[PDB]
Amino acid sequence: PIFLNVLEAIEPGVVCAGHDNNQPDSFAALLSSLNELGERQLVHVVKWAKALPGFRNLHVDDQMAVIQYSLMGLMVFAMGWRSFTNVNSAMLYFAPDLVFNEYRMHKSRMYSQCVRMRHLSQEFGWLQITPQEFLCMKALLLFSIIPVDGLKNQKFFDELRMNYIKELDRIIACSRRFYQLTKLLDSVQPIARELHQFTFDLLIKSHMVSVDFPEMMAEIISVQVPKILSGKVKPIYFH
């Protein structure tokens, strides 16, 4: 199985947040670590994406755009899978050193979104999703959000997306399975959008609440994320 060989080969390993677990769970502390973790995971997502079958076919600018637009959804989906496999969706396993219990969920002021992410993590159990299904679905999430006006080379993107859908169907090769996985994929987007809204608001008030953003995450939040919140860049839903 060549395509699956490649996904398994390129899958990022463990990323720590650098969180100081001896300090008390404050909002500013938890946040500052999530932001640092997000940059660390983006560095890995970029190396991953660059190594995916056909990805280098995209215009370079379209490569960078799609990674930035899809980063949140990728991180949520992979986090839900880590949660499932590590702690049976009991808690949110952002990183080995940043595991959220309920108190954290509350302290982070992200409780409603945390609850949605835990529900997603449970879906992985409720659907019996396989490691191979996980890997194809995650590869497809990179190709699931685009400018309503299209990419620089939209034809190349559509052809890649089409082939990743086909790989997901070949890894299912029942039509019930496909309905359910496409539905699970769609459920990522509303969570990512709420996180993007929370993230943008947090960055605007970050000086007031003492939350630290690495420079590159600041730029992404101020340049890319408002395209999504303004409706210029939108998810491709199946349903």
Binding site: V46, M64, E215, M216, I220, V223
Partner: peptide, 8 residues
Amino acid sequence: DTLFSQHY
């Protein structure tokens, strides 16, 4: 230009 494009 952009910090991301320079990372990329």
